Symmetry: C3
Subunit: 291 residues, 3 copies
């Protein structure tokens, strides 16, 4: 069954097929194979990009959509996630998109249900459709992953994005760098080399920024000086390679991880990422429901 | 007009016709007679099965759907329910599905409004689509209601399900039994015979469990020892008749009214009920909008 | 791309064109020009009827619909409104309908974004589609605005819709009267003559009632004696001219601004206004997306 839980479960060939399908859908390719099928979006945590790009994708595929907010009344408390899924199966749901607070809620659940589950974030674990759309954006820019340097910046240890991305990029032939407060690094990582932002900006083909959370940083790391100290300043961006790009999964904390003036600057692909996410999610749903 | 408020307002022939229509829909029958019509789902109290079951039903009928989720301060400006419905009529709504907190909210309403109202639960009063889907499940199993013994267990006094069900089952020719804490029984119910669970499991063709609320009373009756004391234990289930079934309107409080292992055991029809609910609700909507 | 922010930004010719388009759509004129396009309803603040009316309009135009409300979106993060809209643009939204608490949220936003924004209500209280549907209702009745006497009743000082209506009615050639507690009157107002309700009912072609808020009432006027003292009583309504009409934006506080028996009386157009709202909103959306 074609669940999508983690990037680790996709081969580099599967990944490349998904990017190619997404690119074709972006170019206007459409079919009616999924018309009238039902998708349920179960979001137990807040989301703007992922939730609504999934909805657009479902509707562009001609699907009927059920939306469940799990932190609300439309999901019984204590009443198991397994039962919720089985309930949805019973009423005719063909695929479920889930964002849940628990790391790896998927493992056990996925083996016991009978419709494909698409992980919309089990942070701080995995965010596979976010990795796919980042890869798609990088692939559109350079037409290969081999020999690229991609640097990822911020709280690496707690990032589902940074985690989905570093290992898969290296599997695809890229060199990965990390930067940020040393205390937010996992200095047991095999997939990236820790450097300073000032070094990373000059050697990277892709400068990937993470959101510096206001609501979670239980640290000795001030947001007020973050940009100057660690973030992508205008001066640092000016030292980027000619053909390099800036990426950020959003929402962007303007003036913290990045200078406000750079979010929509020439080298930025931040909003292009969001465009691509819809087509990636269409491809992933098609993979889930194909026979 | 073809409202659906209470099982009492349906003749036994109307009930059998609805079940048959639903069975035909379940089998794959379909038409486009309601395509593009508008349904409004007004759930002023929480719901998972009923609400999403109706939404699937509506969408399978080709209808556009307006959802009003929660007593959220959408229409909370003191507007009468009558004005809310007349408002929906004015904007083009063809049918309203309503779950409300007030018992018999529908009585005054149904003679006053101009579009059909489908009751999705009115306090602890009635829940007619639940009864209908229950009946459909029972009929599929036995191909008759005559001479069946159906036992219903839990807080009979405060149950909209037990109320819809007990009376209609006797009208259809079945015998009804009740079990549960004596404090939760109708002092004077004329439709059922109070017995112990241990007796009921051996004499029933249908064992119907209700949800035991940890909401409200774990004080009137403790939940920790409920299963052993009153509930469908594995030992009790092993004493059920060979052809008997276990039913439950859900959500299930696993380990309280029923042993966790029984929810999807061989005699359980709990998830089949949920399958059937969609087709019952399609049939009810078609009856509402017929001609 | 045509935004809708305030009535004062529309020319009288633009207003007349919108009313004319809406009248044509009300008559059944339809086309497929917007089928499949995406509308996003961002109701950061609650509303019963405006959101539902927009959603019916969108769906009657064949559009796909995304519903947001700030709660379960990454909006509740630090994400700016601009970023939210740009995000929606990127995932393929063609038009946004926004009800938002910030004073003139639109003014900054509309110079910045690349898709049309339709103001469904801002911090200041500007509500152009309400004004448009009121005008449409009036125009259907009399086929002109020129020389009409329109009276508006209640807390004029704190109703920005009353004040925008007065201003636009005056631009359209009508004469505007106000009545209500003298302390709720706007002395500065140059678009209205203050009179008693007892006078206004006899000289008005249109009697426009405002909801009297049990709410607010910092300095309270009593609600219990309000109808007799200031409101549209049966005896007052019976002195209206034969062709005159009663209007109210809803929800109606029955027994306060108006006698309960008058809401659906012969001269009342209250529910007709709500019918008209759908077609006005279809027309405004077609204006927004016309090529």
């Amino acid at each position: 069954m074609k669940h999508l839980t983690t990037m680790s479960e996709l081969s580099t060939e599967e990944i490349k097929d998904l990017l190619q399908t997404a690119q074709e859908l972006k170019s206007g390719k459409t079919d009616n194979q999924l018309t009238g099928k039902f998708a349920a979006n179960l979001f137990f945590e807040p989301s703007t990009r992922t939730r609504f790009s999934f909805e657009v994708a479902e509707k562009k595929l001609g699907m009927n959509v059920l939306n469940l907010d799990g932190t609300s009344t439309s999901v019984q408390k204590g009443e198991t996630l397994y039962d919720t899924i089985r309930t949805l199966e019973s009423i005719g749901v063909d695929v479920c998109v889930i964002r849940h607070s628990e790391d790896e809620y998927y493992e056990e659940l996925v083996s016991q249900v009978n419709i494909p589950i698409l992980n919309a974030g089990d942070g701080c674990g995995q965010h596979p459709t976010q990795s796919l759309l980042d890869l798609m954006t990088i692939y559109e820019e350079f037409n290969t992953f081999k020999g690229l340097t991609v640097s990822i910046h911020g709280d690496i240890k707690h990032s589902r994005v940074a985690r989905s991305n570093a290992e898969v990029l290296t599997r695809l032939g890229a060199r990965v760098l990390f930067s940020g407060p040393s205390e937010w690094q996992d200095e047991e990582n095999t997939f990236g080399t820790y450097v300073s932002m000032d070094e990373a900006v000059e050697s990277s083909d892709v400068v990937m920024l993470l959101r510096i959370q206001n609501e979670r940083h239980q640290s000795a790391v001030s947001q007020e000086g973050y940009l100057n100290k660690y973030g992508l300043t205008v001066e640092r961006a000016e030292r980027m390679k000619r053909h390099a790009i800036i990426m950020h999964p959003a929402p962007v904390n303007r003036g913290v991880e990045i200078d406000d003036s750079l979010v929509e600057s020439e080298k930025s692909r931040i909003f292009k990422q969001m465009k691509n996410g819809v087509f990636i999610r269409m491809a992933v749903i098609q993979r889930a429901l194909q026979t």
